[model samples]
Target: KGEELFTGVVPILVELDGDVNGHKFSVSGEGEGDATYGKLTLKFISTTGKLPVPWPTLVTTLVQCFARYPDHMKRHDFFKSAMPEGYVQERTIFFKDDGNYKTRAEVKFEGDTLVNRIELKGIDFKEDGNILGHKLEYNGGCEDNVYITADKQKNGIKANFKIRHNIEDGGVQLADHYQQNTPIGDGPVLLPDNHYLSTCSKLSKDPNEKRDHMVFLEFVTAAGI
Candidate 1:
């Protein structure tokens, strides 16, 4: 069914000269937007003798990144609400340290946006030689659900999304109406998207007391796409 869509186009993953951990990469559309089914490539800047992440941790972390994209796009409605509609024939992800490791991934419009399928061609963890590598493949996805309070109690909405790999789950609580601000140390108040009210822990009035600690969240442009 899904494979039938790919008739002539082949998906290829190639390793680029850049560090896998370092964000030294760029993406461009193939030919023109309307003319071609898009091709996607992720290149990691090359490393010298050893990588910033150790052999064991590096491989495991890389696997998670590949699977997490689908859920991420769904959470923010990146491609659409339910399904992703796009034509991407060639998909490649490469990590080059004298041809250290590489991965081949397939991007398609699955019925559900929460699922991501990844295929690993091979990984050669040489040099140190302490850790041996081989072919590893898995299917990962995330599902998000919301729970609302009962009709009587004027509460708010609670939401959470869970991943199959058990990497990490994201959950949040949002109040129903605009509530007064309660300062939490020196940190700024946080408000949920589409909600007007902002709230925080009560700020201590005593000058003697220490309100010196600060907690902040950073916002990036779609993982710096």
Candidate 2:
């Protein structure tokens, strides 16, 4: 009975909403993040790739990610030469009435980059916080682009981006339709039990065309934290 079996386990899901210049933008997803899932059968007409192994793979990755914790005094100086303020600080996130933060992620910010640098479990995501250009992807990037690098091996990693520029910047992609936001990208994830769970997010479509200044970020667990 050492082999993995299908059983009762719920996946994690979350939706994040933001307001920019009185406009709306959102992000929602149900993925295992950037963890390295084991493997599946012969590749062909497969609806999805079963977790290569137990969901615990993500947990292990996270623990190792923070092994450096406070970082050694040497690397601290090395980080400054390349990316100033690149030093990493570890923090524990406590949810409302929760025992401990059941998630592991890292963040680093620089003066040149106002925001958008993250490490989700095993995933490495960055943001292009430049004027008139704010793309989200695992690689050098804007606009909800999808990059099939890691998570795609097991699940989808669709960085569903929203239109954030409008009349002021003489740009298009105004936030107007619910079709723009994401819910179908990475939700309804498959559980180890071969069951489906609905942990998706959808932002409100505005009647008036306004710049979507929303930033949505959500996480999902395949089993338990």
Candidate 3:
């Protein structure tokens, strides 16, 4: 029965995205105007266990999940209200990057203004917008729900599209709105937890305490063609 023992970290799970020989990785489209300034990158690393989901598949799902953000989250009305879009809860790792594939379509940019744009378009994303795809019941887990925001920050868009999950039934909301560390950390945050945030450049405060996390997000620009 020890045959399936070393199956947690498989060839597919250890495999990184992009061309190893060509040196291309985490490939995505970059836009002009303000798109050149701001960017978002969803990262994959396991502290407690394996990666929550595949990075590319998660990005593919990132674009499609934009529609289900609900009016409260989009309007920046959640924080003002006593009860936000969803309350806080400790989530588990029932995640998916659209699940089990290398993504068949090419990533593209969408939206008019630089504030709410840069999407991984063209995939026939699963009709269901849940980040974890579908749930078995009140399963405590987090799913990506990309929110195009403005009211949360000062000048223009901070992180054009902010990502997190809907913790309504099962619940998401692992980490609070901490200043997410971009550009990858030298070592793990010593956390074996699975609560990621809807991270971006602005989330990190200059004057305030520079918060940290086990999960990380790194931005990059690949060929537009």
Clashes of 3: 4
Off by over 4 Å in 3: 1-23, 26-65, 69-74, 77-153, 156-225
What are the lDDT scores of the predictions, listed in order? Answer: 0.22, 0.21, 0.24
Q: Tens digits of per-residue lDDT for model 2 on 37-67?
A: 2111110110122221111111211211111
lDDT per residue for candidate 3 within 131-156, as digits (tens), equals 33432222212333223233222211
Residue 93 local lDDT, model 1: 23
Instruction: Tell me how far candidate 2 lies from the true structure as C-alpha RMSD in angstroms.
Output: 20.7
Write one digit per residue (lDDT tens) for candidate 1, span 140-167: 1221221111111211112222212211
Off by over 4 Å in 1: 1-83, 86-99, 130-220, 223-225
Q: Which candidate number has the best TM-score?
A: 1
lDDT, residue 25, model 3:
36
Cα deviation of 9 in candidate 1 (Å)?
A: 32
Models 1 onward score TM values of 0.23, 0.19, 0.19
TM-score of structure candidate 3 = 0.19
Where does candidate 3 have its weakest 10-residue lDDT segment?
82-91
**Quick one: best lDDT, which candidate?**
3
